[PDB]
Amino acid sequence: MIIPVRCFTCGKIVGNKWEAYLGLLQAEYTEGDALDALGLKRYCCRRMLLAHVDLIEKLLNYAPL
Amino acid sequence: PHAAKDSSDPNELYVNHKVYTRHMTWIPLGNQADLFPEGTIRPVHDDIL
Amino acid sequence: IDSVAVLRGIQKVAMLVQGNWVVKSDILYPKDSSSPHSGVPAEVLCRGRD
Ligand SMILES: [Zn+2]
C-alpha cells in the first residue's frame, strides 16, 4: 500500500527516501545508480525500495474525497 | 483555491496531500519548554512520508 | 496507389517531424475520450502531445 518507514532486516530509515527515488526515476537515473546515490550500500534497502509497489495512489483514486 | 485548469499532478490540485513527519508539533508538558530549547525535540529526518 | 493521393491523405491525419510522419493528437484522443491514467480531458492530452 505505502512505503514502510523501517527496513525489515536492518532498520534503516527508508520511508523518507521514496519520493526522492521517484525523482531519480523522473530523472535519467537507472535503478542501480539511483539506489547507489541514495546511500543504500547493503542490498536489503535496495530490495526494499526496488521491490516496493506504490499502491497508495491507486487506492486514493477510489477514496471518497 | 488557485490551480491550473488541468492540474494533472496532485501537487498543484491539492495541498497537504502528503503528511510528512515535519507536521508533527511537540507540545511541552509542565516545564519541558524551559528545559528543552526550541528545535531540540523534533523528528529526526523531518522528511518521512 | 498513386503517391499524391497517399500524401494528401497523410497530410490530414499526420504531421512531419524530422522527415518522419507522426499521427495527430486529436486522432488518437477523440473529443469524448479522456486519459486512462488521470481522467483529464482529451484537449489537455492533445496540447501536451503537440
Ligand atoms: Zn535495509
Curated annotation (Swiss-Prot), chain A:
Zn(2+) binds at residues 7, 10, 44-45. GO terms for biological process: regulation of transcription by RNA polymerase I; transcription by RNA polymerase I; transcription by RNA polymerase II; tRNA transcription by RNA polymerase III. Its main location: nucleus. One of its GO terms (cellular component) is RNA polymerase III complex. It comes from Homo sapiens (Human). Keywords: DNA-directed RNA polymerase, Metal-binding, Nucleus, Transcription, Zinc. PANTHER family: DNA-DIRECTED RNA POLYMERASES I, II, AND III SUBUNIT RPABC5 (PTHR23431:SF11), DNA-DIRECTED RNA POLYMERASES I, II, AND III SUBUNIT RPABC5 FAMILY MEMBER (PTHR23431). This is DNA-directed RNA polymerases I, II, and III subunit RPABC5. It is found in: Nucleus; Nucleus, Nucleolus.
Curated annotation (Swiss-Prot), chain B:
It is found in: Nucleus; Nucleus, Nucleolus; Cytoplasm, Cytosol. It comes from the Eukaryota. Component of the RNA polymerase I and RNA polymerase III complexes consisting of at least 13 and 17 subunits, respectively. Pol I complex consists of a ten-subunit catalytic core composed of POLR1A/RPA1, POLR1B/RPA2, POLR1C/RPAC1, POLR1D/RPAC2, POLR1H/RPA12, POLR2E/RPABC1, POLR2F/RPABC2, POLR2H/RPABC3, POLR2K/RPABC4 and POLR2L/RPABC5; a mobile stalk subunit POLR1F/RPA43 protruding from the core and additional subunits homologous to general transcription factors POLR1E/RPA49 and POLR1G/RPA34. Belongs to the archaeal Rpo3/eukaryotic RPB3 RNA polymerase subunit family. It is linked to Treacher Collins syndrome 3: A form of Treacher Collins syndrome, a disorder of craniofacial development. Treacher Collins syndrome is characterized by a combination of bilateral downward slanting of the palpebral fissures, colobomas of the lower eyelids with a paucity of eyelashes medial to the defect, hypoplasia of the facial bones, cleft palate, malformation of the external ears, atresia of the external auditory canals, and bilateral conductive hearing loss. Leukodystrophy, hypomyelinating, 11: An autosomal recessive neurologic disorder characterized by brain hypomyelination, delayed psychomotor development, intellectual disability, tremor and other neurologic symptoms. Some patients may additionally manifest non-neurologic features, particularly dental abnormalities and hypogonadotropic hypogonadism. This is DNA-directed RNA polymerases I and III subunit RPAC1. It comes from Homo sapiens. The lineage of its organism: Eukaryota, Metazoa, Chordata, Craniata, Vertebrata. The gene is POLR1C.
Curated annotation (Swiss-Prot), chain C:
It is found in: Nucleus. Transmembrane segments: none annotated. It comes from the Eukaryota. DNA-dependent RNA polymerase catalyzes the transcription of DNA into RNA using the four ribonucleoside triphosphates as substrates. Specific peripheric component of RNA polymerase III (Pol III) which synthesizes small non-coding RNAs including 5S rRNA, snRNAs, tRNAs and miRNAs from at least 500 distinct genomic loci. Assembles with POLR3D/RPC4 forming a subcomplex that binds the Pol III core. Enables recruitment of Pol III at transcription initiation site and drives transcription initiation from both type 2 and type 3 DNA promoters. Component of the RNA polymerase III complex consisting of at least 17 subunits: a ten-subunit horseshoe-shaped catalytic core composed of POLR3A/RPC1, POLR3B/RPC2, POLR1C/RPAC1, POLR1D/RPAC2, POLR3K/RPC10, POLR2E/RPABC1, POLR2F/RPABC2, POLR2H/RPABC3, POLR2K/RPABC4 and POLR2L/RPABC5; the stalk composed of two subunits POLR3H/RPC8 and CRCP/RPC9, forming a structural mobile part that protrudes out of the core and functions primarily in transcription initiation; and additional subunits homologous to general transcription factors of the RNA polymerase II machinery, POLR3D/RPC4-POLR3E/RPC5 heterodimer and POLR3/CRPC3-POLR3F/RPC6-POLR3G/RPC7 heterotrimer. This is DNA-directed RNA polymerase III subunit RPC5. It comes from Homo sapiens. The chain holds residues 305 to 354 of 708 of the full protein.
